[PDB]
Coordinates of C-alpha atoms and ligand atoms in Angstrom, one line a residue:
Chain A
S26 CA 150.3 70.4 127.5
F27 CA 147.2 72.6 127.3
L28 CA 144.4 73.6 125.0
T29 CA 145.8 76.8 123.3
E30 CA 143.6 79.6 121.9
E31 CA 145.3 78.9 118.5
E32 CA 144.2 75.3 118.5
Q33 CA 140.6 76.2 119.5
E34 CA 140.6 78.8 116.8
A35 CA 141.8 76.4 114.2
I36 CA 139.0 74.0 115.2
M37 CA 136.3 76.7 115.1
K38 CA 137.5 77.6 111.6
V39 CA 136.9 74.0 110.5
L40 CA 133.4 74.2 112.1
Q41 CA 132.8 77.6 110.4
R42 CA 133.8 76.0 107.1
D43 CA 131.5 73.0 107.7
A44 CA 128.4 75.1 108.4
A45 CA 129.0 77.2 105.3
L46 CA 129.2 74.1 103.3
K47 CA 126.0 72.7 104.7
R48 CA 124.2 76.0 104.3
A49 CA 125.4 76.1 100.6
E50 CA 124.0 72.6 100.3
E51 CA 120.5 73.7 101.5
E52 CA 120.1 76.2 98.6
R53 CA 120.1 73.4 96.0
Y54 CA 125.4 67.6 91.4
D55 CA 123.6 64.5 92.6
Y56 CA 124.6 63.9 96.3
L57 CA 126.8 65.3 99.0
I58 CA 128.5 62.2 100.5
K59 CA 130.4 62.3 103.8
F60 CA 132.8 59.9 105.2
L61 CA 135.2 59.9 108.1
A62 CA 138.7 58.7 108.6
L63 CA 139.7 57.4 112.0
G64 CA 142.4 55.3 113.7
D65 CA 145.4 55.7 115.9
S66 CA 147.6 58.8 115.8
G67 CA 150.3 58.4 113.2
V68 CA 148.8 55.7 111.0
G69 CA 148.3 58.1 108.1
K70 CA 144.7 59.4 107.9
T71 CA 145.7 62.9 106.9
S72 CA 148.3 61.7 104.4
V73 CA 145.9 59.2 102.9
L74 CA 143.2 61.8 102.2
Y75 CA 145.8 64.3 100.8
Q76 CA 147.1 61.7 98.4
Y77 CA 143.6 61.0 97.2
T78 CA 142.6 64.6 96.7
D79 CA 145.9 66.1 95.5
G80 CA 148.2 63.2 94.5
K81 CA 150.9 64.5 96.9
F82 CA 152.7 63.3 100.1
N83 CA 154.6 65.0 102.8
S84 CA 157.0 63.0 104.9
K85 CA 157.0 65.5 107.8
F86 CA 154.5 64.6 110.6
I87 CA 152.0 67.3 111.3
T88 CA 149.5 65.8 113.8
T89 CA 145.9 66.9 113.2
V90 CA 144.6 69.6 115.5
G91 CA 141.4 67.8 116.5
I92 CA 139.5 67.8 113.3
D93 CA 139.7 68.8 109.6
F94 CA 138.0 67.9 106.3
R95 CA 138.7 67.9 102.6
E96 CA 136.4 67.9 99.6
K97 CA 136.5 66.2 96.1
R98 CA 134.2 66.2 93.1
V99 CA 134.1 62.7 91.6
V100 CA 131.8 60.7 89.2
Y101 CA 130.3 57.5 90.6
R102 CA 129.1 54.6 88.6
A103 CA 126.6 52.1 90.2
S104 CA 126.7 48.4 89.7
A105 CA 126.4 46.6 85.1
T106 CA 128.2 49.9 84.9
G107 CA 125.6 52.6 85.8
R108 CA 125.4 56.1 84.4
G109 CA 127.9 58.4 86.1
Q110 CA 126.4 60.3 89.1
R111 CA 128.2 63.5 90.1
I112 CA 129.3 63.2 93.8
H113 CA 130.5 65.9 96.1
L114 CA 132.7 64.2 98.8
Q115 CA 133.3 65.6 102.2
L116 CA 136.3 63.7 103.7
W117 CA 136.4 64.2 107.5
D118 CA 139.8 63.8 109.1
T119 CA 140.0 63.0 112.8
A120 CA 142.8 63.3 115.3
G121 CA 143.8 60.0 116.7
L122 CA 145.1 61.2 120.0
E123 CA 143.1 60.3 123.1
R124 CA 142.7 64.0 124.1
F125 CA 140.6 64.6 121.0
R126 CA 138.4 61.5 121.5
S127 CA 135.3 63.4 122.7
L128 CA 135.6 66.1 120.0
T129 CA 136.2 63.6 117.1
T130 CA 133.4 61.3 118.4
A131 CA 131.0 64.2 118.1
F132 CA 131.5 64.0 114.3
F133 CA 130.6 60.4 113.8
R134 CA 127.0 61.5 113.3
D135 CA 127.9 63.5 110.2
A136 CA 129.6 60.5 108.6
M137 CA 127.8 58.1 106.2
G138 CA 130.8 55.7 106.3
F139 CA 134.1 55.2 107.9
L140 CA 137.7 54.7 106.5
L141 CA 139.5 52.9 109.4
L142 CA 143.3 52.9 109.2
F143 CA 146.1 51.1 110.9
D144 CA 149.8 51.1 110.4
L145 CA 151.3 47.9 108.8
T146 CA 154.5 48.8 110.6
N147 CA 152.9 49.3 114.1
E148 CA 151.3 46.3 115.6
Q149 CA 149.5 48.2 118.4
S150 CA 147.6 50.2 115.8
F151 CA 146.4 47.0 114.2
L152 CA 145.5 45.5 117.6
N153 CA 143.4 48.6 118.4
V154 CA 141.2 48.1 115.4
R155 CA 138.7 46.1 117.3
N156 CA 138.3 48.9 119.8
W157 CA 137.8 51.4 117.0
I158 CA 135.2 49.1 115.5
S159 CA 133.4 48.9 118.9
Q160 CA 133.4 52.7 119.2
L161 CA 131.9 53.0 115.7
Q162 CA 129.2 50.5 116.5
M163 CA 128.4 52.4 119.7
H164 CA 128.6 55.9 118.3
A165 CA 127.7 55.8 114.6
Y166 CA 124.2 56.9 113.7
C167 CA 123.0 53.5 112.3
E168 CA 123.4 49.8 113.4
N169 CA 126.3 48.2 111.5
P170 CA 128.0 51.2 109.9
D171 CA 129.8 50.8 106.6
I172 CA 133.5 50.5 107.2
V173 CA 136.6 50.0 104.9
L174 CA 139.7 49.0 106.7
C175 CA 143.1 50.2 105.4
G176 CA 146.5 48.7 106.4
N177 CA 148.5 51.8 105.5
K178 CA 152.2 52.3 104.8
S179 CA 152.5 49.3 102.5
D180 CA 155.6 50.9 100.9
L181 CA 157.6 50.3 104.1
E182 CA 158.0 46.6 103.5
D183 CA 161.1 46.2 105.7
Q184 CA 159.3 47.8 108.6
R185 CA 156.2 45.7 108.2
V186 CA 155.1 43.8 111.4
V187 CA 151.4 43.1 110.6
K188 CA 151.1 39.9 108.5
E189 CA 148.7 40.2 105.7
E190 CA 146.9 37.0 106.6
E191 CA 146.1 38.3 110.1
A192 CA 144.6 41.5 108.7
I193 CA 142.5 39.6 106.0
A194 CA 141.4 37.3 108.9
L195 CA 140.3 40.2 111.2
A196 CA 138.5 41.9 108.3
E197 CA 136.8 38.7 107.3
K198 CA 135.5 38.2 110.9
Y199 CA 133.7 41.6 110.7
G200 CA 132.5 41.4 107.1
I201 CA 134.4 44.5 106.1
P202 CA 136.6 45.1 103.0
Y203 CA 140.3 45.3 103.5
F204 CA 143.0 47.2 101.4
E205 CA 146.7 47.6 101.9
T206 CA 147.4 51.2 101.1
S207 CA 150.3 53.7 100.7
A208 CA 149.7 57.4 101.1
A209 CA 153.3 57.8 99.8
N210 CA 152.9 56.3 96.4
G211 CA 149.1 56.1 96.1
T212 CA 148.7 52.3 95.9
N213 CA 145.1 51.3 96.5
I214 CA 144.1 54.7 97.9
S215 CA 141.4 55.4 95.3
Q216 CA 140.3 51.7 95.3
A217 CA 139.7 51.8 99.1
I218 CA 137.8 55.1 99.0
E219 CA 135.8 54.1 96.0
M220 CA 134.8 50.8 97.7
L221 CA 133.6 52.9 100.7
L222 CA 131.6 55.2 98.4
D223 CA 130.1 52.1 96.7
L224 CA 128.9 50.8 100.1
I225 CA 127.3 54.1 100.9
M226 CA 125.6 54.4 97.5
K227 CA 124.5 50.7 97.5
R228 CA 122.9 51.2 100.9
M229 CA 121.0 54.4 100.1
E230 CA 119.7 52.6 96.9
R231 CA 118.3 50.0 99.2
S232 CA 115.9 52.2 101.2
Chain B
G20 CA 145.3 81.6 129.1
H21 CA 146.1 78.0 129.9
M22 CA 143.0 75.9 129.2
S23 CA 143.1 72.3 130.4
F24 CA 142.5 69.4 128.1
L25 CA 139.7 67.2 129.3
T26 CA 140.4 64.9 132.1
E27 CA 139.7 61.2 131.7
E28 CA 136.7 61.7 134.0
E29 CA 135.5 64.7 131.9
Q30 CA 135.9 62.7 128.7
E31 CA 134.2 59.7 130.2
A32 CA 131.2 61.9 131.1
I33 CA 131.0 63.5 127.6
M34 CA 131.3 60.1 125.9
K35 CA 128.4 58.8 128.0
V36 CA 126.4 61.7 126.6
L37 CA 127.4 60.9 123.0
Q38 CA 126.4 57.2 123.7
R39 CA 123.0 58.2 125.1
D40 CA 122.6 60.5 122.0
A41 CA 123.5 57.8 119.5
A42 CA 121.0 55.4 121.1
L43 CA 118.3 58.0 121.1
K44 CA 118.9 58.8 117.4
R45 CA 119.0 55.1 116.4
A46 CA 115.6 54.6 117.9
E47 CA 114.5 57.5 115.6
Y48 CA 107.0 60.2 119.3
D49 CA 105.8 61.7 116.1
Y50 CA 108.5 64.4 115.8
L51 CA 112.0 64.5 117.3
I52 CA 112.6 68.3 117.8
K53 CA 116.0 69.3 118.9
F54 CA 117.2 72.6 120.3
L55 CA 120.2 73.8 122.2
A56 CA 120.7 76.2 125.1
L57 CA 123.8 78.4 125.2
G58 CA 125.2 81.6 126.9
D59 CA 127.8 82.5 129.5
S60 CA 128.7 80.2 132.3
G61 CA 126.5 80.6 135.3
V62 CA 123.5 82.3 133.7
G63 CA 121.2 79.3 134.4
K64 CA 121.0 77.2 131.3
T65 CA 121.1 73.9 133.2
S66 CA 118.7 75.2 135.8
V67 CA 116.2 76.5 133.2
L68 CA 116.1 73.1 131.5
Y69 CA 115.7 71.1 134.7
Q70 CA 112.9 73.4 135.8
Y71 CA 111.2 72.7 132.5
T72 CA 111.5 68.9 132.5
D73 CA 111.2 68.2 136.2
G74 CA 109.7 71.2 138.0
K75 CA 112.7 71.3 140.3
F76 CA 115.5 73.7 141.2
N77 CA 118.9 73.2 143.0
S78 CA 120.6 76.3 144.3
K79 CA 124.0 74.6 144.2
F80 CA 126.2 75.5 141.2
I81 CA 127.2 72.3 139.4
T82 CA 128.9 73.5 136.2
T83 CA 128.2 71.5 133.1
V84 CA 131.0 69.1 132.1
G85 CA 131.1 70.2 128.4
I86 CA 127.7 69.0 127.2
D87 CA 124.5 67.2 128.3
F88 CA 120.9 66.9 127.2
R89 CA 117.5 66.4 128.7
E90 CA 114.3 65.1 127.2
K91 CA 110.5 65.7 127.5
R92 CA 107.4 64.4 125.7
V93 CA 105.0 67.2 124.9
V94 CA 101.9 67.8 122.8
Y95 CA 102.1 70.7 120.3
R96 CA 99.1 72.3 118.6
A97 CA 99.4 74.6 115.6
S98 CA 98.0 78.1 115.5
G99 CA 96.0 79.2 112.5
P100 CA 93.7 82.0 111.4
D101 CA 90.9 82.8 113.9
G102 CA 93.0 81.1 116.5
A103 CA 92.2 77.8 114.8
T104 CA 94.3 75.6 117.2
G105 CA 94.9 72.4 115.3
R106 CA 95.3 68.7 116.2
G107 CA 97.6 67.7 119.1
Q108 CA 101.0 66.5 117.8
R109 CA 103.3 64.2 119.8
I110 CA 106.7 66.0 120.1
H111 CA 109.7 64.3 121.5
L112 CA 112.0 67.1 122.7
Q113 CA 115.8 66.7 122.9
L114 CA 117.1 69.7 124.9
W115 CA 120.9 70.1 124.4
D116 CA 122.6 71.9 127.3
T117 CA 126.1 73.4 126.7
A118 CA 128.8 74.5 129.0
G119 CA 129.4 78.3 128.9
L120 CA 133.1 78.3 129.7
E121 CA 135.5 79.1 126.9
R122 CA 137.4 75.9 127.5
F123 CA 134.4 74.0 126.0
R124 CA 133.7 76.3 123.1
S125 CA 134.9 74.1 120.2
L126 CA 133.2 71.0 121.7
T127 CA 129.9 72.7 122.3
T128 CA 129.9 74.3 118.8
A129 CA 130.3 70.8 117.3
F130 CA 126.7 70.2 118.5
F131 CA 125.1 73.2 116.7
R132 CA 124.6 70.8 113.7
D133 CA 122.0 68.9 115.8
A134 CA 119.9 72.0 116.9
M135 CA 116.8 73.2 115.1
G136 CA 116.7 76.3 117.3
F137 CA 118.5 78.0 120.2
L138 CA 117.6 79.1 123.7
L139 CA 120.0 82.0 124.4
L140 CA 120.4 83.0 128.0
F141 CA 121.9 85.9 129.9
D142 CA 121.6 86.7 133.6
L143 CA 119.6 89.7 134.7
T144 CA 122.0 90.1 137.6
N145 CA 125.1 90.1 135.4
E146 CA 125.6 93.0 133.0
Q147 CA 128.5 91.4 131.2
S148 CA 126.4 88.3 130.4
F149 CA 123.9 90.6 128.7
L150 CA 126.6 92.5 126.8
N151 CA 128.0 89.2 125.5
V152 CA 124.6 88.4 123.9
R153 CA 125.6 90.2 120.6
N154 CA 128.7 88.0 120.3
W155 CA 126.6 84.9 121.0
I156 CA 124.1 85.8 118.2
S157 CA 127.0 86.5 115.9
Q158 CA 128.5 83.0 116.7
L159 CA 125.0 81.6 116.0
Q160 CA 124.8 83.2 112.6
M161 CA 128.3 81.9 111.8
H162 CA 127.9 78.4 113.1
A163 CA 124.2 77.4 112.8
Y164 CA 123.5 74.9 110.0
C165 CA 120.7 77.0 108.4
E166 CA 120.4 80.9 107.6
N167 CA 118.9 83.1 110.3
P168 CA 118.3 80.3 112.9
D169 CA 115.4 80.5 115.3
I170 CA 116.4 82.0 118.6
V171 CA 114.5 82.8 121.8
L172 CA 116.3 85.1 124.2
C173 CA 115.9 84.6 127.9
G174 CA 116.9 87.0 130.6
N175 CA 117.1 84.5 133.5
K176 CA 117.0 84.8 137.3
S177 CA 114.0 87.3 137.3
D178 CA 113.3 86.2 140.9
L179 CA 116.4 88.0 142.2
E180 CA 114.8 91.4 142.0
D181 CA 117.1 93.1 144.5
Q182 CA 120.1 92.0 142.4
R183 CA 118.8 92.9 139.0
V184 CA 121.2 95.1 136.9
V185 CA 120.1 94.6 133.3
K186 CA 117.5 97.2 132.4
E187 CA 114.5 96.0 130.6
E188 CA 114.8 98.7 128.0
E189 CA 118.1 97.5 126.6
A190 CA 117.1 93.8 126.5
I191 CA 113.8 94.6 124.7
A192 CA 115.7 96.9 122.3
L193 CA 118.3 94.3 121.6
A194 CA 115.7 91.6 120.9
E195 CA 113.8 94.0 118.7
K196 CA 116.9 94.9 116.7
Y197 CA 117.5 91.2 115.9
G198 CA 113.8 90.1 115.5
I199 CA 114.0 87.6 118.4
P200 CA 111.4 86.9 121.1
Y201 CA 112.4 88.0 124.6
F202 CA 111.3 86.5 127.9
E203 CA 112.4 87.3 131.4
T204 CA 112.5 83.9 133.2
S205 CA 113.2 82.3 136.5
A206 CA 114.5 78.8 136.8
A207 CA 113.9 79.1 140.6
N208 CA 110.1 79.5 140.4
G209 CA 109.4 78.6 136.8
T210 CA 108.1 82.0 135.6
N211 CA 108.0 82.0 131.7
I212 CA 110.1 78.9 131.4
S213 CA 107.5 76.9 129.5
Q214 CA 106.4 80.0 127.6
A215 CA 109.9 80.7 126.2
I216 CA 110.5 77.1 125.2
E217 CA 107.0 76.6 123.7
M218 CA 107.6 79.8 121.7
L219 CA 110.8 78.4 120.4
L220 CA 109.1 75.1 119.5
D221 CA 106.3 77.0 117.7
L222 CA 108.9 78.9 115.6
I223 CA 110.5 75.6 114.7
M224 CA 107.2 73.9 113.9
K225 CA 106.0 76.9 111.8
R226 CA 109.3 76.9 110.0
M227 CA 108.8 73.2 109.0
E228 CA 105.3 73.7 107.8
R229 CA 106.6 76.4 105.4
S230 CA 109.4 74.3 103.8
Ligands
GNP13 N1 156.3 55.8 104.1 C1 155.0 56.2 104.5 N2 154.9 57.2 105.4 C2 153.6 57.5 105.6 C3 152.5 56.9 105.0 N3 151.3 57.5 105.5 C4 151.7 58.4 106.4 N4 153.1 58.4 106.5 C5 153.9 59.2 107.4 O1 153.5 58.9 108.7 C6 153.3 60.0 109.5 C7 151.9 60.1 110.0 O2 151.0 60.5 108.9 P1 149.7 61.3 109.2 O3 148.9 61.3 108.0 O4 149.9 62.7 109.8 O5 149.0 60.4 110.3 P2 147.6 60.7 111.1 O6 146.8 59.4 111.1 O7 146.8 61.8 110.4 N5 148.0 61.1 112.6 P3 147.0 62.1 113.6 O8 145.8 61.2 114.0 O9 147.9 62.4 114.8 O10 146.5 63.4 112.9 C8 153.8 61.2 108.7 O11 155.2 61.5 109.0 C9 153.6 60.7 107.2 O12 154.6 61.3 106.4 C10 152.6 55.9 104.0 O13 151.8 55.3 103.4 N6 154.0 55.6 103.8
GNP14 N1 117.7 82.5 142.0 C1 118.0 81.9 140.9 N2 119.2 81.2 140.8 C2 119.3 80.6 139.6 C3 118.5 80.7 138.5 N3 119.0 80.0 137.4 C4 120.1 79.5 137.9 N4 120.4 79.8 139.2 C5 121.6 79.5 140.0 O1 122.7 80.1 139.4 C6 123.8 79.2 139.3 C7 124.1 78.8 137.9 O2 123.1 78.0 137.4 P1 123.4 76.9 136.2 O3 122.1 76.4 135.7 O4 124.4 75.9 136.7 O5 124.1 77.8 135.1 P2 124.8 77.3 133.7 O6 124.4 78.4 132.7 O7 124.3 76.0 133.3 N5 126.4 77.4 134.0 P3 127.5 76.5 133.0 O8 127.5 77.0 131.6 O9 128.8 76.6 133.7 O10 127.1 75.0 133.0 C8 123.4 78.0 140.2 O11 123.8 78.3 141.6 C9 121.9 78.0 140.1 O12 121.2 77.5 141.3 C10 117.3 81.5 138.6 O13 116.4 81.7 137.7 N6 117.1 82.0 139.8
WTU15 C1 126.1 54.7 110.1 C2 125.4 55.9 109.4 C3 124.7 55.6 108.1 O1 124.6 54.5 107.7 N1 124.1 56.6 107.1 C4 124.1 58.1 107.2 C5 123.1 58.8 106.4 C6 123.1 60.2 106.4 C7 124.0 60.9 107.1 S1 124.0 62.8 107.1 O2 123.8 63.3 108.5 O3 125.3 63.4 106.7 N2 122.7 63.4 106.0 C8 122.4 62.8 104.5 C9 121.8 63.8 103.8 C10 121.9 65.1 104.7 C11 122.2 64.6 106.1 C12 125.0 60.3 107.8 C13 125.1 58.9 107.9
WTU16 C1 119.2 76.2 112.0 C2 118.7 74.9 111.3 C3 117.1 74.8 111.1 O1 116.6 75.9 111.0 N1 116.3 73.6 111.1 C4 116.8 72.2 111.2 C5 116.2 71.2 110.4 C6 116.6 69.9 110.5 C7 117.7 69.6 111.4 S1 118.3 67.9 111.6 O2 118.9 67.8 112.9 O3 117.2 66.9 111.7 N2 119.4 67.3 110.4 C8 119.5 66.1 110.0 C9 120.9 65.9 109.3 C10 121.5 67.3 109.1 C11 120.5 68.2 109.6 C12 118.3 70.5 112.1 C13 117.9 71.9 112.0
MG17 MG1 146.1 63.7 111.0
MG18 MG1 125.1 74.2 133.0

C-alpha cells in the first residue's frame, strides 16, 4: 500500500475544483453553505450524498480517495414558514480510512456543519461516534459545532445490530439530532440534511 | 514512484499542528494575517521563518513533516503619499510552513485556502530549484483562493557565495515577467529576511484597504 501519483492527482483535482468554486464566489443566490460528512469507512457517506443530489444508489463499494465534494442548489425556508432563500450547497465528502485522517481533518475548517454517519449494521462504527465527536470539538472552527447524526443503512433490517434506543440515547446525551437513513431507498436523507442546513441558518441568524 | 502513506508518528505530528491551528483560530491582536511559504525541499523555508521569528539558525537539515506554522506579533504602518507613514497597527502573523517533497503535495495544497499571500523560495545554489519556480507560480494561480495572489519571491542562501549558481539576471527577469517582488535572502545571517516578509505583509495590507 502506497500513495500513488493517480490518487494524489485525483485529490489535487478536487482541490483545483474547490478553489475555482471559491474564486467564482468572490465575484458576486443568497448564501454558499458548506457542510462535511464524516464517519468510519464504509458507513455510507458517499452513497448518502449521491442519493441526496441525484436520487441514485450504487451497491458497489468505491472507497473515497481522500476527499471529494458535491454541490446542490436548494431553496431554504426559515422558521412561521419564511420566504425561500436560494442556497448553494457544497457537500464535502471525507474518506473514513485512518490513512486519510490528516488530509480530511484539514478540511474541517471549511465546514459550517457536520453530517456524522455510522452503520446501523456495524456496532464498531456506532461505538466510534464519540471519538468522531471529540475530533470535531477539537478541530472544528467554532466551539460546539453543529452536528446531525445519521444511523445509515436502515434498509438492512435483518443485519441491524445497533438498537434504536441506544442511538437516540447517545444523541440525546450530546444534544444533537438523530435520523435513521438509507442511501439505498432515500429514507430520511433530505430530512437529515435539511435539519443540518436549518442549524447552520439558525446560527448565522443569531449573530 | 512509491510514495509512503504517513506513518502514525507523521500523522500524530500533523494532527498536533491542526489542533494548534484550530485553537489559534477559535481565539480569533488587531489583525490575523496569514501567509504560507512554499518551494522545493531543502531551499530553506523552515530556516527563513525561524530566522524571522527567533533570530536563530540551525545548520542541521530537519525536513518538515508535512506542515507546521510559526507566529509573530508585529506592528505595521501604512504608506501613503509624501511617505505619510500611518498609525501603528497590531498584526498577529501566522506563518504557514510547507514541506517541499512531492509526497506532501496534496496535504500542503489543502492549506492554500488559509493563506492571504505566499513566500516562494528557491535556492541560489540549486539551479533546478530556480527552474521549478515557474511551475510553483502556476500551481499558485491554480490553487490560491483569490485571483493573482500576492507573492514575494526569495532566492535564499545568499551567504553561500562560493556555491551560487543562479544568475541574478534570470531571477530578476523572471520576477519582472510575473510582476512579483524579488529578494535575495539568507536565513543564516538574516539578510533581507524581514524585508521580504514585510513587503509581503504590505501587499496584503494594501490589498485589504482597496477591497
Ligand atoms: N443497503 C445499503 N447499502 C448501503 C447504504 N449506504 C451505503 N451502502 C453500501 O455500503 C458500501 C459503503 O458505502 P460508501 O458510501 O462508499 O461508504 P463511505 O462512508 O463513503 N466509505 P469511505 O469512507 O471509505 O469513502 C457500498 O457498497 C454502498 O453500496 C444503505 O443505506 N443501504
Ligand atoms: N548557509 C545557509 N544554509 C541554509 C540557509 N537556509 C537554509 N539552510 C540550510 O539548508 C538546509 C535546508 O533548510 P530547511 O530550512 O530545512 O529547508 P526546507 O525548505 O524547509 N526543506 P523541506 O521542504 O524539506 O522542509 C538546512 O541544512 C539548513 O540549515 C541559508 O540561507 N544559508
Ligand atoms: C464550527 C464552525 C461554524 O460554526 N461556522 C462556520 C462559518 C463559516 C465557515 S466558512 O469558512 O466556509 N466561510 C463563510 C462564508 C465564507 C467563509 C465555516 C464554518
Ligand atoms: C489569495 C487570497 C487573498 O488574496 N486574500 C485573503 C483574504 C482573506 C482570507 S481568510 O483566510 O481570512 N478566509 C476566511 C474564510 C475563507 C477565506 C484569505 C486570503
Ligand atoms: Mg466515500
Ligand atoms: Mg522545512
